[PDB]
Design an enzyme around this catalytic site. Structure first.
Site, mmCIF file in Angstrom:
data_model
loop_
_atom_site.group_PDB
_atom_site.id
_atom_site.type_symbol
_atom_site.label_atom_id
_atom_site.label_comp_id
_atom_site.label_asym_id
_atom_site.label_seq_id
_atom_site.Cartn_x
_atom_site.Cartn_y
_atom_site.Cartn_z
ATOM 1 N N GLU A 257 78.602 79.973 9.252
ATOM 2 C CA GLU A 257 77.362 80.555 9.722
ATOM 3 C C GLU A 257 77.037 79.765 11.002
ATOM 4 O O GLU A 257 77.017 78.527 10.987
ATOM 5 C CB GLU A 257 76.323 80.354 8.637
ATOM 6 C CG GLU A 257 75.156 81.295 8.690
ATOM 7 C CD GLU A 257 75.559 82.765 8.597
ATOM 8 O OE1 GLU A 257 76.445 83.193 7.807
ATOM 9 O OE2 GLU A 257 74.884 83.477 9.344
ATOM 10 N N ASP B 86 63.342 77.746 10.321
ATOM 11 C CA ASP B 86 64.034 76.452 10.249
ATOM 12 C C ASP B 86 63.140 75.238 10.136
ATOM 13 O O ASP B 86 62.117 75.142 10.807
ATOM 14 C CB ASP B 86 64.978 76.286 11.454
ATOM 15 C CG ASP B 86 66.226 77.168 11.313
ATOM 16 O OD1 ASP B 86 66.988 76.926 10.319
ATOM 17 O OD2 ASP B 86 66.382 78.112 12.158
ATOM 18 N N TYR C 27 72.615 87.355 1.064
ATOM 19 C CA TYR C 27 72.047 86.015 1.134
ATOM 20 C C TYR C 27 71.084 85.798 -0.019
ATOM 21 O O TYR C 27 70.039 86.451 -0.071
ATOM 22 C CB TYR C 27 71.287 85.828 2.449
ATOM 23 C CG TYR C 27 71.164 84.358 2.808
ATOM 24 C CD1 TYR C 27 70.266 83.493 2.096
ATOM 25 C CD2 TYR C 27 71.957 83.799 3.793
ATOM 26 C CE1 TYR C 27 70.162 82.136 2.435
ATOM 27 C CE2 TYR C 27 71.866 82.459 4.118
ATOM 28 C CZ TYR C 27 70.978 81.625 3.433
ATOM 29 O OH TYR C 27 70.910 80.287 3.809
HETATM 30 O O1 LIG Z 1 71.037 74.121 4.014
HETATM 31 P P1 LIG Z 1 69.721 74.544 4.673
HETATM 32 O O2 LIG Z 1 68.564 74.287 3.748
HETATM 33 O O3 LIG Z 1 69.556 73.983 6.099
HETATM 34 O O4 LIG Z 1 69.816 76.125 4.800
HETATM 35 C C1 LIG Z 1 70.910 76.653 5.559
HETATM 36 C C2 LIG Z 1 70.429 77.919 6.223
HETATM 37 N N1 LIG Z 1 71.110 78.329 7.447
HETATM 38 S S1 LIG Z 1 71.399 79.896 7.518
HETATM 39 O O5 LIG Z 1 72.093 80.222 8.718
HETATM 40 O O6 LIG Z 1 72.105 80.308 6.326
HETATM 41 C C3 LIG Z 1 69.924 80.632 7.476
HETATM 42 C C4 LIG Z 1 69.722 81.766 6.686
HETATM 43 C C5 LIG Z 1 68.461 82.391 6.624
HETATM 44 C C6 LIG Z 1 67.397 81.860 7.360
HETATM 45 O O7 LIG Z 1 66.114 82.415 7.354
HETATM 46 C C7 LIG Z 1 65.769 83.592 6.662
HETATM 47 F F1 LIG Z 1 66.017 83.452 5.363
HETATM 48 F F2 LIG Z 1 64.481 83.809 6.893
HETATM 49 F F3 LIG Z 1 66.499 84.583 7.148
HETATM 50 C C8 LIG Z 1 67.587 80.725 8.145
HETATM 51 C C9 LIG Z 1 68.845 80.110 8.201
#
Ligand SMILES: O=P(O)(O)OCCNS(=O)(=O)c1ccc(OC(F)(F)F)cc1
Ligand SMILES: O=P(O)(O)OCCNS(=O)(=O)c1ccc(OC(F)(F)F)cc1
Ligand SMILES: *Cc1c(COP(=O)(O)O)cnc(C)c1O
Ligand SMILES: *Cc1c(COP(=O)(O)O)cnc(C)c1O
Ligand SMILES: [N+]
Ligand SMILES: [N+]
EC number: 4.2.1.20
Lengths: 267, 394, 394, 267
Positions: free
Chosen positions: D49, D60, D175
């Site tokens: 990703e 984030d 997801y």
């Molecule tokens: O391990 P962490 O806690 O840093 O999480 C990893 C996430 N990175 S990601 O690209 O999957 C990712 C996936 C969804 C996100 O936001 C949403 F759900 F609103 F869409 C943000 C980042």
């Protein structure tokens, strides 16, 4: 006593006007102020107007505001002023001595007691600058009980009622104001209205002394010619003090020269 | 000779140089005339409504009084244009100046609020305004000096005497004594020579008139007491006047106790000074044993007038009103409490009235009492004063 | 699925992470319910009247327009408790938070006025308030930060991104995405995801409702145009809403032109930015050629929102409203003119609306026009900004 | 292409879950980021990703906020990201590559053009973080026109309507969010609700990857045991970058060790 009555009678006998300087008691210090006052007298002052330093002199322009401030810088109090007054009178028995007061210093610890202390030190008159005739009753009554002349102000616009009041209530001399505004040599007033001077005589008022803005001999002669008994000058005298603070000797010399010229103009 | 009584019992009068008597007589005549003139009344009412924002709210303060038998309303003069009650009477005085044909305004100011109120009224109504302010105050009140200048007023520093409010008061009268034919003196509180204490009261009395109507509407009865801070007396007399004949209504005036009455560092001449004559009136004042005039001290720079209006001294003498004091620390606590529990930032002046109400409640929390505090102004001007203390103490 | 339309033509929507959809749906449902609930309406009306000081005055400004055929009224939101229009809708939002059973408030702020409005509403209504503010804004807005703290709010500096308003907007949404079950997000303008543009409009619409009644009362007709500054859009939509169906009434929104549109240093995305998606909505915004979000520049720190409410973009697209810009120098001149000729110190934000009215008058001084400017706030906060310029230029 | 379908089929054949790291493209610079990504792959990442730096990443937490800031400090732009993506795909033909986007970067210069550029560089999926299913239509349609999987988020509280929508609209993988809030290793999420995992399978959704707060091997094995196809970890990987900025060699070593352990937990 009758010091103003005796003075005016003498001056009238010599076809002469009065010249009356004003200074702030204790400006720029008690000892120098005693000397200044002796110099004014020796140089020909017919009478004196003497200010007691007051925190809020709201009828005074900057020159006399600064005289009050200098006296306060020297720690001058009303009690010390009364000590000065007793000494002045002991040296000079006949010269009329008028105080320029603000109401709070007179009312402070009893109006009657104030005028009694004036009588004890030999003061002849008191002019309370912020008491108009309309508020004057307890002041003038206390003044008269203690043989002190209460002095009232005749503005250049005085109507008949006011002229009659000033004539009836005052004693000693009638203060003829040369203009509106506050004390200061930088602002010259008018010739006395011959109308006011004559109405005052008509009502047997105390003889008139013109004051405010009198700073030159020509003004003194002009006051007397218009029918006033004399002229008072304050800021012009105090400016000589202010100018010569660094030089007491020159201060007394310039005071003597100025007073002599002003008195010569009254003859 | 006057049309109205210049005295309130032994207090008041017209202790001005003879030269100013006609200016006072002219002003009184114009006032008496204006008060009977429905067009004057309508013009004043219109400015108060559509320019200044009257009527002001009456706010019930429920969080502050929770768990007690006190119900507390605040009269919201903080919501008036300019942020304080001073706006009411400068609009009336500006209209009187115009009625007399005067084109110029002289005003005195200490902390600057009256200066700003006079400047804004003069800007609206086409008058040329000059304001005297003691040089020490000019130095300490840049925000208000700059507001006055933005409004087109001339601000003139006064360097004589103590270079504070009383010295500015003198200078205003010195100027007027020479300029009265063209200038009106717009005095800032319910004090000075007659007719000012009367005029200032009548041009502030809408505070108590509205309070009475508003409390009748909400509560169906008069307040047990109305409480107001007292500097010179204008906001307090404005709140009190319409209740004076309602003998069940307590009138409580709160003077600044500064560091404490016993320290001498206070501004409470009504209860702790001595009667004197100054600024055109016979009234209690701050003065030395010899009769020199002194400054009033308070944390609130607007409670600096060193005497008190004569009608307050009179209402006290006859027992119609009671006067009390609140210290700097009490006022600061009331300031903090109103911010935190009501979301209203009160002027530190007004915080004195609120502190005394809080004390009435806290001392006797099961006494049933309906109270109104006059919230004479907003406290945005005070937030750094309160800051420089509150963090320098936690 | 929603109860109300989330779009105004192509503009608006609900561009939030999936996790926040239920919080928006819950808020919309509670709003729709509140709007039909006479007890909610009465409680809101009571706070507006007795706590905030509504209705606000409508002031005729005769000195400013002398010698022209313009009649100009100012709607006095400067007289509302807090000193700006923001107070209206924070009171409605606080009441909605309580209706939903929320005990905590999150708010974003740039220059600090919304932060203060949220803190005062939270203090009054017993809510625990936390406010996010970009660290550069915290540094520059000590007075407002200290007002928020006196009111019991937690002020949380945001150091990410550009450390200004947009970064505080993000942080507020990050917090809400985890805390929505107990906290309401009290958004500060008529922008963001649905339902906020609609809610903020309905809780500001008393501005135009009162304006209409007040101008009918004085003039017997509707205004030719109502003019309001546009940061995010709340005071403007609040003034416009009740006139949208009065097709003879011009609606003029004024964006900040900063140093001039051609310099790029401005805050006028409606007319000079590009449509993007950010902060929960599709709207014109300040953005780089690549799609990174940029800051809005104006001398007035309150016109810093880098986009514009979607209803404004829509009213522009259909030609119902017209949008214009005014530069720093035009706003400063209008500020000085109102101080000097009317004795009212306007917020530099509001001074943009006034500058455009002054231009309407000055360009065509024999055009008969009845105008209302929304005076969205008072300008006490701006007096040193105006000082540091006006003397450093004379 | 069918890269996620091929991956999941292979992993299912080996009774294995997916381990999928997240990093920000160009953090801490383009060349180092290319090396970081190669190290993740060599150490056993099943898919990637990859975040495009965006000024306002509102889903984030601080760790990834700082990753974006570092990439911007290095001047990283979306155009450079697409250059990086083309190179990554040229080196590694089968690994699925998902982008983490914010809506404005996709919408900026045309949604269709964006998904066309994704297809040209060989990206497999795009997750637009601030577009909920309710707003997703033009994104998912453009994604599908260009053979890109649009990724949707299933919150831990998802009701039936939402599960059916995510199942119908998504492709590639679903997801599965581990909790509310924003990205960050400092906040651990829940076990996947076995209910959600089973409803998603019931509706023939794309296989689920659990993400948010996954920072340890035990969490990876737990995700797979609950029925998820795999786990995503972002902040935990980015924290290794952040900790080792001064030492590129140690950074790659720690990255390799962490990724190896996390991937071992998927078996
Ligand atoms: O391990 P962490 O806690 O840093 O999480 C990893 C996430 N990175 S990601 O690209 O999957 C990712 C996936 C969804 C996100 O936001 C949403 F759900 F609103 F869409 C943000 C980042
Ligand atoms: O020569 P100037 O211009 O300084 O004037 C001299 C005046 N000194 S004084 O004591 O007579 C004097 C007389 C009256 C005063 O005020 C009042 F009229 F209100 F009473 C003030 C001072
Ligand atoms: C000046 C001032 C006062 C005190 O003056 P009064 O004449 O006693 O009312 C009180 N409150 C505020 C807000 C002020 O500005
Ligand atoms: C914040 C602010 C604005 C701009 O915000 P809008 O939502 O566009 O109304 C305008 N005026 C004042 C006084 C403000 O404080
Ligand atoms: N005082
Ligand atoms: N803007």
């Amino acid at each position: 006593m009758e010091r103003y009555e005796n003075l005016f009678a003498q001056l009238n006998d010599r076809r002469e006007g009065a010249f009356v300087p004003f200074v702030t008691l204790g400006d720029p210090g008690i000892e120098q102020s005693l000397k200044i006052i002796d110099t004014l007298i020796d140089a020909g002052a017919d009478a004196l107007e003497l200010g007691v330093p007051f925190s809020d002199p709201l009828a005074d322009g900057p020159t006399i505001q600064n005289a009050n401030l200098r006296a306060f810088a020297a720690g001058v109090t009303p009690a010390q002023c009364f000590e000065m007054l007793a000494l002045i009178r002991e040296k000079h028995p006949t010269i009329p001595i008028g105080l320029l007061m603000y109401a709070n210093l007179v009312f402070n610890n009893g109006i009657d007691a104030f005028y009694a202390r004036c009588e004890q030190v030999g003061v002849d008159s008191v002019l309370v600058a912020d008491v108009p005739v309309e508020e004057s009753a307890p002041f003038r009554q206390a003044a008269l009980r203690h043989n002190i002349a209460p002095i009232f102000i005749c503005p250049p616009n005085a109507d008949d009622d006011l002229l009659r009041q000033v004539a009836s209530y005052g004693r000693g001399y009638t203060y003829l104001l040369s203009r509106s505004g506050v004390t200061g040599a930088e602002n010259r007033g008018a010739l006395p209205l011959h109308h006011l001077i004559e109405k005052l005589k008509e009502y047997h008022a105390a003889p008139a002394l013109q004051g405010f803005g009198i700073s030159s001999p020509e003004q003194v002669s002009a006051a007397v010619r218009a029918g006033a008994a004399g002229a008072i000058s304050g800021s012009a005298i105090v400016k000589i003090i202010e100018k010569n603070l660094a030089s007491p000797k020159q201060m007394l010399a310039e005071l003597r020269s100025f007073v002599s010229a002003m008195k010569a103009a009254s003859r | 000779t006057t049309l109205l009584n210049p005295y309130f019992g032994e207090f008041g009068g017209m202790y001005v140089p003879q030269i100013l008597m006609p200016a006072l007589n002219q002003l009184e005549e114009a006032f008496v005339s204006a008060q009977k003139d429905p067009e004057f009344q309508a013009q004043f009412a219109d400015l108060l409504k559509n320019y200044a924002g009257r009527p002001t709210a009456l706010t019930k303060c429920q969080n502050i009084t929770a768990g007690t038998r006190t119900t507390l309303y605040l009269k919201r003069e903080d919501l008036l244009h300019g942020g304080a009650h001073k706006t009411n009477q400068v609009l009336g005085q500006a209209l009187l100046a115009k009625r007399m044909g005067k084109s110029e305004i002289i005003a005195e100011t200490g902390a600057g609020q009256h200066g700003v109120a006079s400047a804004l009224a003069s800007a609206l109504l086409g008058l040329k305004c000059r304001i005297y302010m003691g040089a020490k105050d000019v130095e300490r009140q840049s925000p208000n000096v700059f507001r006055m200048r933005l409004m087109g007023a001339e601000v003139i520093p006064v360097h004589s005497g103590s270079a504070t409010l009383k010295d500015a008061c003198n200078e205003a009268l010195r100027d007027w004594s020479g300029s009265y034919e063209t200038a009106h003196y717009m005095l800032g509180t319910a004090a000075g020579p007659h007719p000012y204490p009367t005029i200032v009261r009548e041009f502030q009395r809408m505070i108590g008139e509205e309070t009475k109507a508003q409390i009748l509407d909400k509560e169906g009865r008069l307040p047990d007491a109305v409480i107001a801070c007292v500097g010179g007396g204008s906001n307090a007399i404005g709140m009190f006047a319409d209740f004076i004949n309602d003998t069940s209504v307590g009138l409580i005036g709160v003077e600044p106790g500064g560091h404490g009455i016993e320290t001498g560092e206070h501004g409470a001449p009504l209860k702790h000074g001595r009667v004197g004559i100054y600024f055109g009136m016979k009234a209690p004042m701050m003065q030395t044993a010899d009769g020199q005039i002194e400054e009033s001290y308070s944390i609130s720079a607007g409670l600096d007038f060193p005497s008190v209006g004569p009608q307050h001294a009179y209402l006290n003498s006859i027992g119609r009103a009671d006067y009390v004091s609140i210290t700097d620390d009490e006022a600061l606590e009331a300031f903090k409490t109103l911010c935190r529990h009501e979301g209203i930032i009160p002027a530190l002046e007004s915080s004195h009235a609120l502190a005394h109400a809080l004390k009435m409640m806290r001392e006797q929390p099961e006494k049933e009492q309906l109270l109104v505090v006059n919230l004479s102004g907003r406290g945005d001007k005070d937030i750094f004063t309160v800051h420089d203390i509150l963090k320098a103490r936690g």
